[PDB]
Design a protein around this ligand. Structure first.
Ligand SMILES: C=C1[C@H](O)CC(=C/C=C2\CCC[C@]3(C)[C@@H]([C@H](C)CCCC(C)(C)O)CC[C@@H]23)C[C@H]1O
Ligand SMILES: CCN(CC)c1ccc2ccc(=O)oc2c1
Lengths: 11, 240
């Protein structure tokens, strides 16, 4: 939830 | 005995750690330089090391069996709450009893109590951080046990905000049972004595280390002049 960089590194 | 599945898990976690942990520390040349001249002198350097270390912990986490069956939101909750803990655990590999420091290959990249103070933290964190490192070092873990401990720490069902706790528990259980069973079959006495329970104790020490760090981090980061010295990834992951 508003964690664009973490979500990117996780994809 | 140690099942085929359990042997597979350990092989996976070893490989994942090796891909995400360079024991030469070659990438440390990309970090803002260290300065040990100067309040918060070491903050740029250590902010960068942690930001890198965050990325590497994510790259480890992704390769944990089961981790990806988790929703993206749960993956996020688990990494956000465990990141500092896994950086503390993974740092034990560079940490040396010889002089109570993290030894990353060269004098430039060797960090002690004073360095961590020059990054905005106090002894209320650093002292029990060093003692943790010493207690973890004394266990003399097999690399297999090390990678399983980091994995078990990432996949903890109790972290607040976890929607699908039962799936997180089942994933963790597979790793916990792999670890109990590995200690029994491959870790000879006396080093194996209560070793599991001493490993889980370290997970409890990490909760307390996490809390303290979160609180010193809040105080550090509220000051917009220090938050300027951090990275965007450290800001998103630890908070803003
Ligand atoms: C690659 C690695 C690890 O990922 C991290 C390494 C060391 C870890 C350290 C040594 C210096 C002090 C560190 C960074 C601690 C320090 C309190 C983190 C501070 C982060 C901040 C943003 C300033 O709050 C945590 C872990 C400690 C070296 C090496 O073993
Ligand atoms: C040889 C390919 N790579 C990544 C460089 C690695 C790195 C570390 C390990 C560690 C263990 C393992 O079983 O395989 C590995 C492969």
């Amino acid at each position: 939830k508003n964690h664009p960089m973490l979500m990117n590194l996780l994809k | 005995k140690l099942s085929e599945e359990q042997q597979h898990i350990i092989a996976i976690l070893l490989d994942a750690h090796h891909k995400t942990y360079d024991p030469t520390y070659a990438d440390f040349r990309d970090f803002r330089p260290p300065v040990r001249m100067s309040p918060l002198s070491m903050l740029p350097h250590l902010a960068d090391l942690v930001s890198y270390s965050i990325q590497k912990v994510i790259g480890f986490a992704k390769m944990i069996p089961g981790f990806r069956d988790l929703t993206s939101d749960d993956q996020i909750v688990l990494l956000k709450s465990s990141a500092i803990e896994v950086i503390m655990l993974r740092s034990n590999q560079s940490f040396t009893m010889d002089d109570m420091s993290w030894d990353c290959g060269s004098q430039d990249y060797k960090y002690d109590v004073t360095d961590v103070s020059k990054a905005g933290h106090t002894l209320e964190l650093i002292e029990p951080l060093i003692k943790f490192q010493v207690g973890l070092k004394k266990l003399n873990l097999h690399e297999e046990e090390h990678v399983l401990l980091m994995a078990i720490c990432i996949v903890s069902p109790d972290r607040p905000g976890v929607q699908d706790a039962k799936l997180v528990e089942a994933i963790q259980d597979r790793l916990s049972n792999t670890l109990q069973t590995y200690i029994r079959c491959r870790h000879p006495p006396p080093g194996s004595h209560q070793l599991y329970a001493k490993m889980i104790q370290k997970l409890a020490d990490l909760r307390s280390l996490n809390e303290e760090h979160s609180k010193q981090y809040r105080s550090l980061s509220f000051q917009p002049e220090n938050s300027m010295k951090l990275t965007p990834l450290v800001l998103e992951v630890f908070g803003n």
